[PDB]
């Protein structure tokens, strides 16, 4: 093979961003659990809307954190020979974008 020590530095940067994405994804999961909670809970139809709308700041904070992750990924310059780093970066970007699409789904179904 042709694996370089220099690439280990880039893969370590990517592994930290992967862990950061996992932390935000757990916030999105708790929001999802909470959102269902209000919907399938004991609050009357009226009180539910207000409670679901209180999650707006949190959904927006989740979206913003993902955007900051994207901006940090965008600062990487990975030469053509760093095949594994280019794959990890692409997979991570696609992962974040799919989570962002889930956030938009949440955002569109609250505060209406």
């Amino acid at each position: 093979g042709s694996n370089s020590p220099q690439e280990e530095v880039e893969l370590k940067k990517l592994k930290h961003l992967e862990k950061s994405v996992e932390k935000i994804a757990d916030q999105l999961e708790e929001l999802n659990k909470e959102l269902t909670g209000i919907q399938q809970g004991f609050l009357p139809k009226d009180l539910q809307a207000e409670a679901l709308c209180k999650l707006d700041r949190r959904v927006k904070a989740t979206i913003e954190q993902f955007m900051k992750i994207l901006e940090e990924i965008d600062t990487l310059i990975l030469p053509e020979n760093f095949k594994d780093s280019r794959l990890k970066r692409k997979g991570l970007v696609k992962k974040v974008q799919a989570f962002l699409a889930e956030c938009d789904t949440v955002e569109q179904n609250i505060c209406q």
């Binding site: 700041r57 904070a61 913003e64 901006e71 965008d74 600062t75 990975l78 970066r89």
Partner: protein, 381 residues
Amino acid sequence: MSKGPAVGIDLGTTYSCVGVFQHGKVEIIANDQGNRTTPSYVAFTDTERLIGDAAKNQVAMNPTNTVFDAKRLIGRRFDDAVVQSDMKHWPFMVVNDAGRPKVQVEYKGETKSFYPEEVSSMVLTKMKEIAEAYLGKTVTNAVVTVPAYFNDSQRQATKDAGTIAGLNVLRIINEPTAAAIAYGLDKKVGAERNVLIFDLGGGTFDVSILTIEDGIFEVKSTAGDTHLGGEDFDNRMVNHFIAEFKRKHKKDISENKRAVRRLRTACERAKRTLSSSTQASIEIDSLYEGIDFYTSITRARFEELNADLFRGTLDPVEKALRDAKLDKSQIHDIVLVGGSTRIPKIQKLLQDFFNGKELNKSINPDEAVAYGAAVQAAILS
């Protein structure tokens, strides 16, 4: 904590900076987030009030309740042409309270209004605290800087912000006077000196001419552009890239706010790199419709896109020389202030104008005003 020394505070439009003279040298003070400069931002949420980095970081989530640009309002009447024109571009509300402007936001569920000096006092409190955290001592005395064109009301309103913040304002000094002090232009032996300050940063452009005779400062003229800064250079870069993505992929990314933001942020970083390098590379994965945007910009391309804006910086210099009744040959010293003065072309243009005269640029342009104020604070304590 024990009593601490006097500090220099540069109360900027977009960013503020605090410095302390100790051990025969100025130390710019980094904040808790490790930044030497702090956003002049105040955010009001449902649970708390945020200042600096924390307020700027949540601006996308709470735009109407995140106040910035209070310097643009400080000391002004509501019906001021500047207040009315700036109002259109702010996400937050500006209301009239008996002829005075007030920022209107929602704080903890309720509607609250603050005078510009109250907002600036929150920013000064944070700068006071940034200094206390580093020094391990209580900070009360400070020198606060204001632009040379500030009137009686604008200067009093700034001194009031200091008072509200629990500060003892040793002196209020002009930002170009502060930059001259930083370079020790008042300590040079000889006849009176004519100094031109070229301040391009923090969203404003200011050109000032000063005369110094026996350590005495006189403002001879002030000129500039109220809304010219680095953001204008970024827009040109973004436009160039949008045009490029259209040429290459026949797709328009401009109506996608997240693609435009990703591109803009990459442009701001590429601009900074082009001040020390002749080429900047950008790699953005799945920018728009899955398309990876791997590009590059040369320093010559960036200069061309911004040629008019860069050239236009000399008009204010000419206007300032006219008003000060001075020829460009009568200027002893030229001082660079603001982050945008790091741009090599701006430097080349300005030096060529003064027929190859060397520029005072060694102090960080962003920290030069706070540096001088810190020196002044040490002199007055």
